[PDB]
Every structure is written in structure tokens, then in C-alpha cells.
Amino acid sequence: CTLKSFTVEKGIYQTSNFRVQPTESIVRFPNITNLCPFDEVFNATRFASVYAWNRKRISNCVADYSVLYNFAPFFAFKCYGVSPTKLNDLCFTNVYADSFVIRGNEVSQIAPGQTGNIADYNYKLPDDFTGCVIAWNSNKLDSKVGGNYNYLYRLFRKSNLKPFERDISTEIYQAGNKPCNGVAGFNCYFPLRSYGFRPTYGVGHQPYRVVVLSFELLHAPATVCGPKKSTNLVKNKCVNFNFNGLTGTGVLTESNKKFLPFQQFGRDIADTTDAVRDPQTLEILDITPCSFGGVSVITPGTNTSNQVAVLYQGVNCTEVNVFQTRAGCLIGAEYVNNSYECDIPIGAGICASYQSIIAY
């Protein structure tokens, strides 16, 4: 199949790579379980204005995002750096809920890289933002027939804001050459203006409540995790593990590496995970990739015989007519003390021939 022919000439051919598969999946998550206060953020009677948007830190809780889906008048549920359905399977830190009220047409401006008024002078998102934006209509609660003017936006500012920066300074703006000296007048306007929210207006102008969930991915110890249950730890076996949202396939072994108390992960010269410190039990598990190697099929011509031998390159014979060579483990050929000329080259001074297939 590899050579795309029904006749194979005499020689050694590299066909595939043997790799031992994992036997069971182990998930290790922090044992601590606290119901996360999402009710406070999502069910609040009053939200802040866009210029003074409310930021709440979420930490040291286990979050069930399934209920967010179960009850939801949220017309918009848009995630940028993570899948909505994978949130229950991951661990996070730096979780922030930013709540504010904006217009119907301004929901497009709560995005990375957007040019706008509330984007520049009220609420700025970074270009590398990860998380989910939730938007829902709040005409029933955040509007009045006479006009709900409680929500204000910064129309005028000297410079654009930074990401995750709030400006509540009620200082006058100078819109012209003439200085204003803190007094309103010609070409001197107040920066903060109120929205005219009325229920009689159509969609696009109705008040919308927006909550922005912001996360960080794996670059710190995590305190917010999904509802996934912690499994027991197994040693010296090939398993597919999930440590705090980090999935890998390897063997977990005891380690003699003196980790410092802050240190969690471990890395090799390739900056790839080589050890992990479990949150639930503070012990260091060295991570070693499961046994693998290249398979070479040593065969004579199909005209002569159909017998084959396999060489597992760089793999000792105890991790897979068995002969151990420096090249690897040879299965199907019998070592012969007698020395002959090289017929099929194996490597490290070892050659194979057909007489059964012998190795010498």
C-alpha cells in the first residue's frame, strides 16, 4: 500500500509509526466547589452606564454555563476566543464580567478593532480579546415612557481610552480654539450626554444590556473551572489526561524535580509540557510521551517469498524470533552468528537476508 505496487522488491521500507494508545482518560480538577455568583451579574435590576461600566472579578468558583443556556432572553451570545460549548471543560483565571447598557445599534462596536464613539471614549476592547459578549434587550426595565435618561455616554474626549479603562471625570471639553475655562458656552459642550430611551421606538434604538465575560488562557494558575469531576491519578501508564484544561497523552510518573511553590507546569528545551503540578493534590507528576517509533518492513521480493520482518526503530524489545539491535527491536528474523555479506541493510552493523529471514 505504501509503495503503491503489488510487487515489492527486496529491501527495507519505512511504512508507518507504531505508537501505544492511551488506555483511559483521567481528568484532574480542583476539589473545591463553590456555586459561582452569576445570579448577581445576570439578574441585577440596575446596570451601570457605558462611561462607568461595572467590572466584577470572578475567581475561586466552579461555573456551570449550562444554566446560562437554559434560561436566556439574550438575543446576542457571541464568543470570540473560545467555543460556547467547550466552556464547561476548561479552567480559567482572570475572569471578568463587564456590565453596561448601550443602544441597539451599538452592539457591533463592542468588538476588537472597532471604530466608534463608545469604543474609543467609553469602553475599549483589546485586539487579542478572548471571551464572550452577551447582549439582550432591556426595554421592559431600562426604559421609561417619559424618557429614561439615567444612562450616559462620553461623546467628547481629548484622546481614546485604553482597553479595560473607565473614565468618570466630569470635566468640560474644549471643542474649539477658544479655551472654555470650565464654563459652558459657544463651542464648549459637556462630554457626557444621556440616552433618550423610550419604549415607543423601534429596534436599533431600544436599550440593550451587554455583559462581557473576559478570560485568560492557561498563562496563570486557574481558579475558575468547569463542572467536570476529578478522576483518580494513575502512574506509569499511557493515559490522556486533562490538568486544568490542559489535555495531553503521556505517562505520568513520579518526579525528583524540586519545583518551587509558585511553579506549576514544567517544560523541556522545546518549551513543551514535561511535568505538571496537580491543584487537588500538590504533587509533581513528570509527563513522558508514550512509547513510539518507526516501523520498517524488511522483506525479500514477492517473487521469492511473502515472509516479512518488522524493525521498530529506537525502541527496546520490552516495550512492544525477537532480536534487540542498536537500530531497534527486530521481530520475525532470527539472529545467526554466521557472518555473511549485507543483503538487506538494517543498521548498526546488522543486515538481513532470506535463506526464513535471518539477521546477522
Partner: protein, 256 residues
């Protein structure tokens, strides 16, 4: 009860190779790792402050810039913590770090700080540190990092909501206070503060006299400023940073 008691003199010294810290919480052993972070540059100008109270306002507030390297050879009881913020009054949030014999209290409130803040022992009172503290939004109590010749080094960074404090305690044999060699500082706490910090000030402890209301005292400390710099750190067999080269210091280190 704000009273002006501390006068301060300042001199300039060399940083040598002090101020290296672990840039992340990843164990690396026997590798050369190049990282770009806020580091104190090698052989940089560090200000040595002597704060003297003898038994007018002469103790100004220092800038924070992009982060602060702090060092002291004094005992753990004289220097008792720090103050961080912008205006240091009731209109903006501020961070107060106060250590005592049993624990450390890190607390972010709207403190109306005194011009010359100091913790006075008599029990300990913070009425000379601030006159009021309202709308307080953060509190964190933990084991102290000023415990008991011994050089104490700290690195303060204010990055994306977190105030990161790194610390090392090194026994320095009698000689130059800022010694040669490498003593990498370890990450001590990351605090999710999210405030604007442009200015900072050191807190001292003064004892009442009971005989010139406060006992005369002196405190010497070194302040340097972190800059965005690329470092190449050497991680040894046990994961310790034993050496580093600052990539932009000289052409030899740039070649390294």
C-alpha cells in the same frame, strides 16, 4: 493627625546585576531562556534614600514609572510596607501594604493619606498613615514577607490589573550593601487590584518616646526602576536562575 516628621536625603549607586526575577511560573531546568519583560537594567542608576526622623515637609512621594525594584539592608521592623496610588487622597483608589510581627495586610481603599505617613508603635496605629478610609474595595491578609546583614529585595509590577510582588531574602556578608552575583527573586504574590499606580511611598515605623514625641530613627533603602528589556536567563539543574545577560546592555551581552 498628619504630622511631618521624616526628612529624606538621596544618593546614586549602581544596580550591578541585582533585580532578576522569575518571569513566569513555569519550571525550567538547565536551559537558556530569552524573555522580554519589565526588568531592572544591569549597572543602572539606583537611588539610595536615607530617611531620618530627629527628635516642614521634606519627604516627597516617589514616582512608580513602569515598576519598582526595592532593596533594604535594614531590619524587618523599621520598614513596614508601602503605599501605591496616583493622588493619594480620598478621590482615587490606593493600595496600602502594612507588615507587622504576625502577618501582612494588603488593602485597597480610598485612603486620605498623610503627607508624611508612618506607622507609630505605642499597639500600632494607622492614624498617622491616613486620616480616613472609605469605599474600601479590597483586603488580603497573609503571612508576612518582612521577617528576620540580611538584604531584602522586592520587585513591584502593575500589569493588566495585577500588582505583582517578587521577593528574595539574601544573607549578605559585611561589605557593599548591593552585592555582586545573582540572587533571582521569586514571585511572592499576584494581587488582582486593577488600579492606576503612578506614584509610591515607603512606610516606616516610629516608636513613641514617653519623655520629641517620637523616637529618633533612620532607614536606608534602594529604589530602581524597571524598563522593558529582553533578558537571557540561565536555568541550572535545580531550576534556579543562576546567571543572566541583559541583551541591550553592551555589544558583548548582545552577542550572547
Amino acid at each position: 493627625q498628619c504630622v511631618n516628621l521624616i526628612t529624606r536625603t538621596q544618593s546614586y549607586t549602581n544596580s550591578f546585576t541585582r533585580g532578576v526575577y522569575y518571569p513566569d511560573k513555569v519550571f525550567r531546568s538547565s536551559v537558556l531562556h530569552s524573555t522580554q519583560d519589565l526588568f531592572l537594567p544591569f549597572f543602572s542608576n539606583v537611588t539610595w534614600f536615607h530617611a531620618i526622623h530627629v527628635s516642614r515637609f521634606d519627604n516627597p512621594v516617589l514616582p512608580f514609572n513602569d515598576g519598582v525594584y526595592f532593596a533594604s539592608t535594614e531590619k524587618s521592623n523599621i520598614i513596614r510596607g508601602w503605599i501605591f496610588g496616583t493622588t493619594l487622597d480620598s478621590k482615587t483608589q490606593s493600595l496600602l501594604i502594612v507588615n507587622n510581627a504576625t502577618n501582612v495586610v494588603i488593602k485597597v481603599c480610598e485612603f486620605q493619606f498623610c503627607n508624611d505617613p508612618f506607622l507609630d508603635v505605642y499597639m500600632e496605629s494607622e492614624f498617622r498613615v491616613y486620616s480616613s478610609a472609605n469605599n474600601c474595595t479590597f483586603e488580603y491578609v497573609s503571612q508576612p514577607f518582612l521577617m528576620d546583614k540580611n538584604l531584602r529585595e522586592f520587585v513591584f509590577k502593575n500589569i493588566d490589573g495585577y500588582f505583582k510582588i517578587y521577593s528574595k531574602h539574601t544573607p549578605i556578608n559585611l561589605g557593599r550593601d548591593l552585592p555582586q552575583g545573582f540572587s533571582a527573586l521569586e514571585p511572592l504574590v499576584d494581587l488582582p487590584i486593577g488600579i492606576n499606580i503612578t506614584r509610591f511611598q515607603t512606610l516606616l515605623a516610629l516608636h513613641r518616646s514617653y519623655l520629641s514625641g517620637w523616637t529618633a530613627g533612620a532607614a536606608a533603602y534602594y529604589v530602581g526602576y524597571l524598563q522593558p528589556r529582553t533578558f537571557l536567563l540561565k536555568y541550572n539543574e535545580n531550576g534556579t536562575i543562576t546567571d543572566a545577560v541583559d541583551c541591550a546592555l553592551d555589544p558583548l551581552s548582545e552577542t550572547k
